[PDB]
Amino acid sequence: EKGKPLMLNPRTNKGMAFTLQERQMLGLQGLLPPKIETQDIQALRFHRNLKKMTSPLEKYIYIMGIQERNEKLFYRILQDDIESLMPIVYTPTVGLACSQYGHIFRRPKGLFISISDRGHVRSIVDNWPENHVKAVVVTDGERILGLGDLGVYGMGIPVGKLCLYTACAGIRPDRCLPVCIDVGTDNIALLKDPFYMGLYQKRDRTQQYDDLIDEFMKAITDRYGRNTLIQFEDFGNHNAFRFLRKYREKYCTFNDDIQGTAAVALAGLLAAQKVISKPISEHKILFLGAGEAALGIANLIVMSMVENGLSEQEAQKKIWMFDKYGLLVKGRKAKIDSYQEPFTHSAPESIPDTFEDAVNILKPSTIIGVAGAGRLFTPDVIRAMASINERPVIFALSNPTAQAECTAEEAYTLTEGRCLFASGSPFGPVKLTDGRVFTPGQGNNVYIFPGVALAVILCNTRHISDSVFLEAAKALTSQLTDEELAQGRLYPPLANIQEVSINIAIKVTEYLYANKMAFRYPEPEDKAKYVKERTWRSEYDSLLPDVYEWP
Amino acid sequence: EKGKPLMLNPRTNKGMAFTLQERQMLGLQGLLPPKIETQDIQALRFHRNLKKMTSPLEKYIYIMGIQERNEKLFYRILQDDIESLMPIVYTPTVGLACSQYGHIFRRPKGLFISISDRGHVRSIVDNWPENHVKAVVVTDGERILGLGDLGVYGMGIPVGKLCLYTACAGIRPDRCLPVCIDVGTDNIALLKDPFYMGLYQKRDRTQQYDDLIDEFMKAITDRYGRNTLIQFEDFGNHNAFRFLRKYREKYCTFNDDIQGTAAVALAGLLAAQKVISKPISEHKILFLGAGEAALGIANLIVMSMVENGLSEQEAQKKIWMFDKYGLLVKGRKAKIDSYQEPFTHSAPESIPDTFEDAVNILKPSTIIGVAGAGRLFTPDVIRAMASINERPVIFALSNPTAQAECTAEEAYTLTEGRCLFASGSPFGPVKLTDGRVFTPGQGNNVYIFPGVALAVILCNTRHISDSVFLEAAKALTSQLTDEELAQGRLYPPLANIQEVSINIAIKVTEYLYANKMAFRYPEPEDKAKYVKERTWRSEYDSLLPDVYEWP
Amino acid sequence: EKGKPLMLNPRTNKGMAFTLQERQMLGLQGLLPPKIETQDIQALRFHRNLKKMTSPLEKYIYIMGIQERNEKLFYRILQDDIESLMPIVYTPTVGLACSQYGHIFRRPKGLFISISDRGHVRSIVDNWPENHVKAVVVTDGERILGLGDLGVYGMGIPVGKLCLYTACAGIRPDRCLPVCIDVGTDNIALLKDPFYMGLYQKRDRTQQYDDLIDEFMKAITDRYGRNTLIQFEDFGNHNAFRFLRKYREKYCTFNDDIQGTAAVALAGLLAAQKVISKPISEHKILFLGAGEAALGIANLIVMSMVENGLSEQEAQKKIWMFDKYGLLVKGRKAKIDSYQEPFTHSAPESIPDTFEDAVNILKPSTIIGVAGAGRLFTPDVIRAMASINERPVIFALSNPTAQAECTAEEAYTLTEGRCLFASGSPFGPVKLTDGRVFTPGQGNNVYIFPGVALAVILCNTRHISDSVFLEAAKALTSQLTDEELAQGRLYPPLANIQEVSINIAIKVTEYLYANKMAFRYPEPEDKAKYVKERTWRSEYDSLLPDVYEWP
Ligand SMILES: NC(=O)c1ccc[n+]([C@@H]2O[C@H](COP(=O)([O-])OP(=O)(O)OC[C@H]3O[C@@H](n4cnc5c(N)ncnc54)[C@H](O)[C@@H]3O)[C@@H](O)[C@H]2O)c1
Ligand SMILES: NC(=O)c1ccc[n+]([C@@H]2O[C@H](COP(=O)([O-])OP(=O)(O)OC[C@H]3O[C@@H](n4cnc5c(N)ncnc54)[C@H](O)[C@@H]3O)[C@@H](O)[C@H]2O)c1
Ligand SMILES: NC(=O)c1ccc[n+]([C@@H]2O[C@H](COP(=O)([O-])OP(=O)(O)OC[C@H]3O[C@@H](n4cnc5c(N)ncnc54)[C@H](O)[C@@H]3O)[C@@H](O)[C@H]2O)c1
Ligand SMILES: NC(=O)c1ccc[n+]([C@@H]2O[C@H](COP(=O)([O-])OP(=O)(O)OC[C@H]3O[C@@H](n4cnc5c(N)ncnc54)[C@H](O)[C@@H]3O)[C@@H](O)[C@H]2O)c1
Ligand SMILES: NC(=O)c1ccc[n+]([C@@H]2O[C@H](COP(=O)([O-])OP(=O)(O)OC[C@H]3O[C@@H](n4cnc5c(N)ncnc54)[C@H](O)[C@@H]3O)[C@@H](O)[C@H]2O)c1
Ligand SMILES: NC(=O)c1ccc[n+]([C@@H]2O[C@H](COP(=O)([O-])OP(=O)(O)OC[C@H]3O[C@@H](n4cnc5c(N)ncnc54)[C@H](O)[C@@H]3O)[C@@H](O)[C@H]2O)c1
Ligand SMILES: [Lu+3]
Ligand SMILES: [Lu+3]
Ligand SMILES: [Lu+3]
After folding, report:
1. Where in the sequence is N6-acetyllysine found (chains A, B, C)?
2. Neighboring chain A residues of B547 at a CB cutoff of 8 Å
3. Claim to verify: residue A158 and residue A281 sit in the same structural domain
4. Which helix (H) or strand (E) holds A462?
């Protein structure tokens, strides 16, 4: 192609950063102003403009705009302050954006397969411009973060992650593809909003539903290969948990909200013991709730507990769960799902009633907050664990900084900095009464999924096993400098999420090869330089044709 | 536009004559043989191959090939050997090819409008790739030359024709458009021809046919401009005359079969007298038939008799018509149509039975053989004219050479050479006993329409007046040379048909301006340069961008 | 893409076969005669036309055009009458066309990597409009059949060849790419040909040459992957054997004029013995030449011998070769090449001054005319062998039908039908005095390269071993009927080359597969239906967009 269609395609457009030669060769001369910018000027003007921006959503709507304008530029700036931009491009700003979706709508971004399209998903799947695709993120928006049902308003999610895929891992922007499935909704507020962008109708939980998913999986694979990466996101547990059991062994899929999480959690717990050094067998982990996040970590734990010569059975018997309906035990009045059954150990002599109550009775070495019900890690709770453990482990991942089970402060200050804390949300250093500063640890999934993703793709791996995430964990934590440890943080600084992911890549592509799960041939000798070589760069490319005089 | 499509479109492609640099900058490198030919080299490979060919229609096939192949090479070749290729790319071989259309089809060429498309003509009209179309050529296939109704097999003419408009006048191909309208055919054979490629049904003569032409008429002027020229062709006398009467002053249209013909005749008819010199007033013209081609002329004659000082009446009264049914006289039994009455004079004392009988009875000065009935211009008939006239004028235009009213020999020899003979069929010189080579001329309409077409175009004339044909006629005649006269031809050698039409273009555009029939401003001063300036080239152009250093 | 480009493309064009719906929707109405044809009427128009043809090259020309205007059709027509068209699209008419290339030239047909494009081939590769290429053919026009250095006039071989890959095996056209590499030329005549379409310089042989080959090999692989099939062709022995050993291991390359030829012969020879039954050990084999063919053939034989409980050494020791410099024995006066040594045995007591002479002293079971010098298997040479052996094997591969070492007649007759004949050129049945008719079997490589090519591709077989060709022969050979064996052919009817090749492919896949060299996963339980599926078709395909109401 040539001409303005060049300037129209974000994948090509370089704005003023187009060289005079191209500008001429390409028949652009006169379509751009007499100025030839660099990628540093263009970028400058950006911050120079993002600053004057007030609200974070406004900044989102701005940046997200340079995505459908100039692919390179958009992504260059991305890493430019990847640390600070991430929270606008993704969490939490995107939850805002996702709620606003349909109002702040401007240009479309992903792929849309509706239940009204059943029987033709393929052709649709064939409507997508991109030739080579390797990454696919899909959601049916049923559980858009803590916003619950958001229908197609949720497509904001796929869009976000795929950005990180590239931003911190180096996956090709073209090779990705966010997708949103529309089967209707349940949010009335959504069913009566003239600005909604999907089929106006209650969800579809009939057989039609699965078949549709089925049809799309095949359509995607059919169209792009069987090794093509398919990440399930924001779904309705039940489905999100069964749609995994089902296809995992059939396709190249994985669900971050589950596997992706458990990965980071572990990493946390891990690095903790690296400083605690407490003989596995004696551990006691108690959960403040039995949901998705829980069951998810609960097993990658057992999994690694077991990997240490422990029988799955005795392993999981070291895992206790406490959800709204009280403590998770045998025979209780409330209900307990199949996934729950294992972690539901026969009732202890005396039954607590307060999480705080439980803590005692059971006496866990560890305690994790995943109930998203605000601050339940009372001062008492903390201060009790703080007693029973010479160095307690507390993890409040609930989000946002509104739902955490507690705070970093109450955490350390109520334990003599004798505890090891980690927050799912962000939290500031903590200097205490003795001039002691404790920089805490935030467990974002951005720590895993992008790394695991790059590996599985560059390896032509055909399936993603749990041992992978379990291995992913290690990879991560095994990135914590002793001083980081000294500092007290159980997660590598979010400033270098790149390299960290790039490293995690390596170590995973290696692992893959060793266990012979990688089919990419022929195996390379230097995976380091291997991987590091395959990353996608924002650095512009000359569009000039290869002329050359002929002797 | 770039890539193979450059090589795929005939207008762009130029084969191995594509310069290394264009190849390189256009991305055609390694798509063409490393050799770089010139146009001549190419045009040579052609004439070399053409040589080893046998049947003309075989050639016509080959040649018409380079058309839908390399626009710029095809034509160069044409005006390269015009006098010799003319009767291949067009009559007579084209007559052959039309009857064979379907068995010799390889690729489509013009625009097809069918009554099945009635109501949507416009849309059809809108599918023609070209943007700027100035000259059109329509036909409904009813009377393809002497081959009659040929259904869609006639589309072989609009193309042939236009080749001349372009090769002779110097008109821009991408500005012409050969159109073919389908309303069934009446040819049973075709009707049963399994390769016939039109609608399988009787010719529709209902009201619909009228509306179609209309819809099309307007649909074309709409999309292209009411100043856009439309030439009617191989049509059916009855229609070709009314449509001519109708849209004449409504659009920029005319008809070759009538208008075109008429002019060329007179051309001869003046080149003759020019050597004869016989006081108009004593002139007596007689037609061997009274159809289309006769009345078409009969009036071009009048107009000029009346231009010389006669009155409409006194002029025609010097014209007589004798068709199959005998002498055309006031009250005669056979039918006389409104377009004949004028020339149907009052019965001369004696009514002749034979054309030769009439020859005496009337005592004409000029004899016109247009009945297309072969040798009816009997040696006697010759000898008679030759007697009663010390300088008889005989015109056998019937075609082909067979239907000819006679032959130059039986004319010149049977007159000692005291006859000014012209034929619508090719005849070589005739050396008699005393040893005198006379080159009888032929009156191809190819002399007219192009040059006029040429002028009417660039003059943005809105309507074609017959006065233009009469004028045109002079133009052509006045091309003659005393030597061309002394040689015996009243028509200029086909060889320089280039200049011949070009030169006519000028003189005609001039006439247009002066009578104000021209709307192209500003009116140049030196018309000669004007036109010679506006003639399409055959020589290659560049596609190479305009690159240059910015100081 | 729609409108004219869609019919401007040989791949998409369907001529009058475009449905009305495709016509209206794709904006083609009017652009095509109002007649919707069917492939059958189209193809019908072609034979009915080809008939009136005469010269064999003429037909060639006529059919090679259908190729550049409408794929599907061309081929449809092709395999329609593959037997009669094969020789026209290929040998022995192809050579007629290579010699006349440029003297016939109309439109480019493949890739062109000149030595002048050195250091840039990649880009040139990048100019090929096809995105997924899987089959490649390359040649340097140095030894194009018994014609010799033909320059870029030889491009016609890959092109043609490719046609059969398709027409015979079922390989997707857009995935095939024929290539020619201009490095100058040693044939003078061409160097003086004003039409010559290549580098008007002497054949470069310096280091630049190989380097270019390499630059290319990767260039291709770079763009189309590594597993991309690369068959060599009509090179100058020398390089053919070297580049062979070279890239053989680093690429999916192979050479038909070596590995292919072989396979056919052994398929002939395997056949013979099936009706001869003479326990290997007692086999003796001579050769009328030691150039290219000889060695190739020879070895695969050795390979099989080996296969049957033998030893490389003795094996070839059972093989002898008599070139134009006497026989290939130890210490002879002429020059023996490295590839020739393992067949240049130690001189037997008396040394043969003649083939006939060597025929006795050696008294071989099998004989093979691969000298292409003509009839050297004289009636004596025949009868002699006839005598010596009760069931003698004679194979005269030399081509055309002029270099044939003998003929089926002089074979079957001068042996009462005691021999096992097999010729390279074409020959029809032979009836004897005792009214005994025998069809002589022809051994074209067309029987092979397709089937295989097809296999390697579909199986992503990264490399092509010799154990496959030999395994190919067996498979081919195994396609013979006992009645077919009755008539006496060692080669199945060319009339069923489709299946033959397909079935050969099926057999090979399982092989490639079972031998763990097929990488395509998952390995299909049914190779039959498997291969049988992915076969390309000549049946047109709808263009209509997938439309459907939304409930
Ligand atoms: N200038 C450019 O845009 C440019 C230049 C050279 C190569 N390439 C591309 O590189 C590819 C060849 O790579 P390879 O086969 O040697 O690699 P590989 O086989 O080592 O990689 C394994 C698979 O992962 C894909 N892949 C590689 N890096 C990726 C990334 N960073 N993000 C997402 N997917 C990735 C590959 O296409 C391949 O299918 C070609 O498809 C080509 O299009 C692009
Ligand atoms: N990477 C991360 O940082 C990350 C990842 C996943 C989940 N999370 C956090 O975990 C929280 C829950 O997410 P989820 O996916 O597990 O949801 P979920 O619905 O699966 O979990 C809810 C569980 O918590 C229990 N619960 C709710 N309120 C309770 C209360 N007031 N007291 C006691 N138990 C209560 C419920 O019984 C239920 O079993 C969220 O706030 C989220 O921010 C963080
Ligand atoms: N530029 C040229 O050289 C040129 C141009 C136009 C027409 N022509 C020739 O004129 C001939 C007729 O064309 P037209 O358009 O006038 O056709 P037409 O059918 O309209 O007219 C033919 C006339 O001749 C009469 N006629 C038929 N047979 C006759 C016979 N046997 N004896 C006497 N009269 C007879 C008919 O009554 C009819 O009126 C054609 O054969 C054609 O070759 C030549
Ligand atoms: N290299 C090229 O291809 C090239 C270069 C210069 C101009 N042009 C073309 O010339 C046109 C401008 O015409 P102008 O205003 O100078 O002319 P003009 O005003 O002198 O002519 C008046 C009319 O005649 C038409 N015309 C001119 N030459 C013609 C021809 N050779 N055949 C058929 N129709 C013809 C014009 O389009 C115009 O409608 C532009 O539309 C442009 O596309 C082409
Ligand atoms: N599938 C087939 O049917 C098939 C395949 C390949 C080759 N061939 C035929 O094989 C013949 C040669 O091809 P090639 O590949 O062997 O090429 P080549 O040029 O490498 O082989 C020539 C050999 O024959 C010998 N020779 C030359 N003249 C001789 C003579 N006058 N007397 C005895 N020996 C002589 C030479 O020493 C040389 O060893 C051709 O005619 C060709 O038609 C047929
Ligand atoms: N209407 C159409 O033209 C149409 C429709 C559906 C699919 N397809 C094509 O089929 C391909 C899917 O192949 P698969 O995954 O089943 O292959 P596969 O894995 O079963 O086959 C192995 C390899 O052989 C190649 N291959 C298969 N048939 C071929 C042929 N006939 N000619 C040349 N190469 C061939 C494949 O591309 C593949 O790389 C897609 O690339 C798609 O473009 C075409
Ligand atoms: Lu999520
Ligand atoms: Lu006409
Ligand atoms: Lu060959």
Report:
1. 134, 202, 218, 250, 324
2. 21, 24-25
3. no
4. none
Active site amino acids of B: 90, 161
Query: Do C196 and C283 share a domain, yes or no?
Result: no
Question: Which residue among C234, C357, C399, C449 is best mutated to probe the pocket of ligand 5, counting the most ligand atoms within 8 A of its Cβ?
Answer: C399
Q: Residues near C545 by Cβ (< 8 Å), separated by ≥ 6?
A: A123, C25
One domain, residues C408 and C425: yes
Q: Tell me how far CA of residue A422 lies from CA of A282, A290, A391, A411, C403, in angstroms.
A: 21, 19, 13, 9, 88
Q: How many domains does chain B have?
A: 2
**Distance (Å, whole) CA A410 – CA A401:** 14
Structural domain of B75: 1-255
Structure tokens at C222: 């770079």
Q: How many angstroms separate the alpha carbon of residue B159 from the centre of ligand 8?
A: 12
Residues 114-133 of A with CB under 8 A from C: 116-117, 119-120, 123, 131
Angle between helix C449-458 and helix C466-477 axes, rounded to 10 deg: 120
CB-closest option in A120, A545, A551 to C546? A120
**Alpha-carbon distances, residue B491 vs B471, B502, B511, C307 (angstroms):** 16, 16, 22, 88
Element (H, E) at B360: helix B355-362
Whether the upstream peptide bond of residue C400 has omega within 30° of 0, thus cis, is yes
Percentage helix, strand, coil, to 5, in chain B? Answer: 50, 10, 40
Q: How many B-C residue pairs are in contact by the CB < 8 A criterion?
A: 131
Closest atom of ligand 1 relative to the A536 alpha carbon: 31
DSSP per residue, B181-223:
EES----HHHHH-TT--S--SPPP-SHHHHHHHHHHHHHHHHH
Q: Hey, what are B341's tokens?
A: 């009455």
Domain limit, last residue, from B217, B240, B255: B255
Using DSSP's 3-state secondary structure scheme, residue B115 falls into helix
CATH number, domain containing residue A482 = 3.40.50.720
CB contact under 8 A, B197 and C113: no
State whether C30 and B112 contact (CB < 8 Å): yes
Q: ∠ at Cα A235 (A230, A240), nearest 5°?
A: 70
Secondary structure of B376-428 in HEC code, one letter for each residue = CCCHHHHHHHHHHCCCCEEEECCCCCCCCCCCHHHHHHHHCCCCEEEECCCCC
Q: What is the CATH number of the domain that holds B28?
A: 3.40.50.10380
Are residues C310 and C218 both part of a single domain? no
Give CA–CA dist B490/B477, Å, rounded: 7
Nearest CA to ligand 1 atom 24: A458
Q: How far is CA B150 from the centre of its chain?
A: 19
A208–B contact, CB cutoff 8 A: no
Q: Identify the three-state secondary structure at position C542.
A: coil
Identify the experimental approach. X-ray
Buried b (16+ CB within 10 A) or exposed e, B269-292: bbbbbeeeeeeeeebebbbbbbbb
Is any Cβ of chain A less than 8 angstroms from the Cβ of B31? Answer: no
Contact (CB, 8 A) for B215 and C52: no
**Resolution stated for this PDB structure, in Å:** 2.9
Q: Does the active-site annotation cover A251?
A: no
- CA pair distance A104, A98, nearest whole angstrom: 9
Q: How far is CA C281 from CA C308, C349, C365, C388, in A?
A: 10, 22, 11, 17
For residues C399 and C543, state if they share a domain: yes
Domain termination residue (choose one: A232, A255, A278): A255
Buried-state track B463-480, b at ≥16 Cβ within 10 A, e below 16? bbbbebbbbbbbbbbebb
